[model samples]
Target: TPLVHVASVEKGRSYEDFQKVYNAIALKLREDDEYDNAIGYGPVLVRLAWHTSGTWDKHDNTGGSYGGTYRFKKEFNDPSNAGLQNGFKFLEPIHKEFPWISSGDLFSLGGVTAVQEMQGPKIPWRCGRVDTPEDTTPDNGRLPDADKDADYVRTFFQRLNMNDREVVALMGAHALGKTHLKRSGYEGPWGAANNVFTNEFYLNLLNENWKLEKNDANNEQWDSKSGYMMLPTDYSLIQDPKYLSIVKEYANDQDKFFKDFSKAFEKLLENGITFPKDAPSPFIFKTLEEQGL
Candidate 1:
């Protein structure tokens, strides 16, 4: 195990330093509410953070958030990342302002900011990802494919070192973003409150009447009269006995769902990066409402 020791909290920067970046991202999320049919950039930003961090290969530490490799052409051009360019574009201004923040940190922090700004859970975050050379970027095909079975879902998350509970919690994020027909070949939002973060992904899964059919792209998907959709991978959670037990629990309890999601999400973004033992405690950011905005 060649421990990846390249990431940690910024040397001289404290919570106040990162708070500025959070403020900027939060402000843009507010101003940009008209984007994506009023869903704003929150979901995509969350996707960016996940995409950037989800590449971790826990076995050998081959890929992960230690390097913000998604900035490179090889990783950026990944087919699985079709719609995330919108998130990258959205963050450019923030990056331009906070040049001191590393790509990994900024990308991951955008997730935390969006979650809090969108009325999701407050994710505790830390920063210290210095840029790696392009050669350090992981190859394409590292991200998880949205189309797959529950077994594949379970096996795939193992590469990132997540267990069943964490995996179910993380999937709750699907409630935040819709599938763009053009970008992902799948259409429709997964829940009614697409802009807000809730366990509605689990709720919809447990309650909706889903119909199996192929999309225009000839890919199989689950559809419903409630104007909701689910990928085969999303659908798999309920079909598997083990995963289903966890799914139903989250569907029934919002507070437990939020807390678990926060833990798993923070763990996901920090993958592959080595934090020092002396590293300060993770910072839990306050929402704009908390600041009286």
Candidate 2:
């Protein structure tokens, strides 16, 4: 397979320019009041990019974000992606307007934009991923199950070349979005501020008095009247003792959490691919206000 070169976008279009583009998308996401009652589709967009890329296995080049197959129904309706249709719908308009961008680049860029706009770190991204056809869709069962244990989580992430720290950091993303009854057969917010990015997830993990109980939907998870829930797999981090300290660390320092999360999330999205250091330093796109859009 030949290596894909990053396109030479308009010359003089440096990192800051890309940041402007990111701000445009993020700003629209913030102002748009239609979907999810203006809940802001940022988190799910991040998840969409993560889940799309998560299908890659280092051993073979079969499934990856490189082949934007989610445009197809088979990949889109994968049982594991049950709750993500809302994110896809959110990106539809953007796609229509920017028809030149590949689905792989668009989805991955959405994640980059969301994280930066929310005050997360600057994720370096390169474009070369081409969209794949229906036949190229990865086999189902590539995503992680919510009911699994630490070992299950560990094994699942290993398929994508993620380590224990990366697994813990990425799962922290659950802090950003909720499990919808209609989507994941689970319900309740993972944090007080679902749309805004923060260390509240780590805080809630440590501060809340959680009871291991089944939700109204009968899936066992940690719940509190604070209206927050944690999948059993999510809660497993603390149970492991080794991971508990990092969870506590994030709970204590929002800055540290943001830094670790930025690194881990970017790594999660870039798995199974190689990038040259000379490649443009990752673009830290701005939110609408920052971009003056």
Candidate 3:
């Protein structure tokens, strides 16, 4: 029989408990405006959630959001995860304030909170990711490299069991944050409004007259006259015919992109875990604005 990781809710906790946690994160997101040129921590928190869960290997189910092993040294120090420590730090105080929540839950919930707070889509999330020991921490290099082409991206995501639509939809998160030169060897925001999530990523890719240029860090990235930039992997979406069609679809349809991104992102975060038939349905937390905070 295959080894399986079953979803288990944190004992004695319910939706209200998790909502408080979401409120805490959303409040900090509002209060912390000075970070990254007043863009706040929303984008990076989303990245933290992605990087943490993105390590899942469908074949073995060895590494995933379930372990919360990014707290371990090996995963934390992954070069690809350069700026995510800030996201971890942002969640530290929240975790201290609510210690019963598992690291995996906190991490993934942080992303969901960030997205909704930033006026993105509602990402239905489940909490039950028990932290495994450090030995369960996956080695680095499981994440996709920004320097690769479409074929590489296509092949890379297959290991995570993502189809073309899922990969393209998830990459829409790039619409949120910029690439930091010091952190990612590339630089510039994908759009003017880096804090807000939209279909602009696909739009910019389709509309921008991008010029391939080298940054101060000497990495090749597609830059526009408007001072925006895209990693090669991002550009690859339009480079390939199949991906190009999906990109066009998302670019033209905002609601469709939001819905697709929500589904794909939830699936990405939930990879490698199984829930019993009796487990509760996924929770969709309300944003602070909806609560009139």
Candidate 4:
């Protein structure tokens, strides 16, 4: 399902062929050692996939992972996407090699690959997402602002078709990545296992004796000398009473967190689309190690 008007070279590729392409990209992601000033490209790649899909508004079909328009400068420069340029830069070589794959596929596939490579669940993915021109970029400010309250977080996620349960589960991903001061204007890792896949985000939320402190950067967030931090919006989940129980549940069980997060992240990336099971079973793309890349 080639989505762009490219030369006829890509016209006849099948799913197996696409899998090879997926493998190629996954291979390079594993081998490429330079990213984030040597911090590795894995985390930001996850963020790139997130920022791309997070733009989907269920009420309207405007912004989504379908159009790989992040290749364009306008989408790339969005303020909410600050610090994700590293991800785009990392994928540049892959794009150069497989120029025919749509940006939407590559970006979303990158997300899937990153998750699996980090030992998270295998995300089933499908292709056919098309790219749009510069004019099609969603208006800026569509993403969630980090400095908001629970009501703001809840309202913002409703645009993406996520329920309270899914919202809480997805935020559990905060366990994997950190807020860079230069990026989100917030600093500190969210958990000790910042780059690894685990239920530690939930555990930290429940087990830590958190004190609300102003960081040296002057942003108010929950901080522990354990060297982890939670944004006000993140902390709001436990304080809300309703959300606190679910938070504690995941905190107590890694298996449960993985199950809920797998389902929730898959839904987040697949918002605004309908598919038939008989149409095609979703492809469980292999990680770099699985493919021996």
The lDDT per prediction is 0.89, 0.75, 0.93, 0.77
lDDT of 3 by residue, 1-293 (tens): 33488889999888999999999999999988889888899999999999999999998897889989999999999999999999999999999999999999999999999999999999999988898988889999998899999999999999889999999999999999899999989999999899998899999999999999999998899999998999999999999999999999999999999999999999989998898898878999999989999
| lDDT comparing candidate 4 with the true structure | 0.77
- Off by more than 4 A, model 4: 1-10, 37-39, 274-279
The TM-scores, one per candidate, come to 0.97, 0.89, 0.98, 0.90
- lDDT for model 1, on a 0 to 1 scale? 0.89
Per-residue lDDT of model 1, residues 1-293, tens digit only: 75565556666888998988899999999998888989899999999999888888888886677788899999999988998999999999999998889888889999999998888888998778777889888888888787899999999998889999999999999999899888888988999988899899998999999999889988889999988999999999999999999999999999999899999999998877777778788899888789886
Residues 38-101, model 2: lDDT tens digits: 5677878888998898888766766777778888888898988987887788778777776766
Candidate 2 stretches with Cα past 4 Å from truth are 1-21, 276-278
Candidates arranged by lDDT, highest first: 3, 1, 4, 2
**How many angstroms is residue 47 displaced in model 1 relative to the true structure, after the best TM-score fit?**
0.4
Prediction 2 TM-score vs. true: 0.89
Candidate 4: clashing residue pairs, number: 0
Off by over 4 Å in 1: 1-3
Instruction: Give candidate 4's TM-score.
Output: 0.90
Q: Which clashing pairs does model 1 show?
A: none
Give the range where candidate 3 is weakest over 10 consecutive residues by summed lDDT. Answer: 1-10
